[PDB]
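Q: Give me a protein?
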Amino acid sequence: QSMRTECNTARGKGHMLIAYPGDCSQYISCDSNDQSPQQCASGTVFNSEKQRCDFRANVPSCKV
């Protein structure tokens, strides 16, 4: 309608696209072939160094 290509210098506010949710993690189910049951309970009784860090590629970080 009316040429408004002059005072269009206020078009620099397109940095508000952080609304993206966190429901895009449906690819962490590779455990089927990436089973990483990190349950190394290596706790030498001569150096109490229990490295039991449950890191199962199918379970949430359960470091023990």
Q: What stands out?
A: Residues 10 and 25 are 36 Å apart (CA to CA).
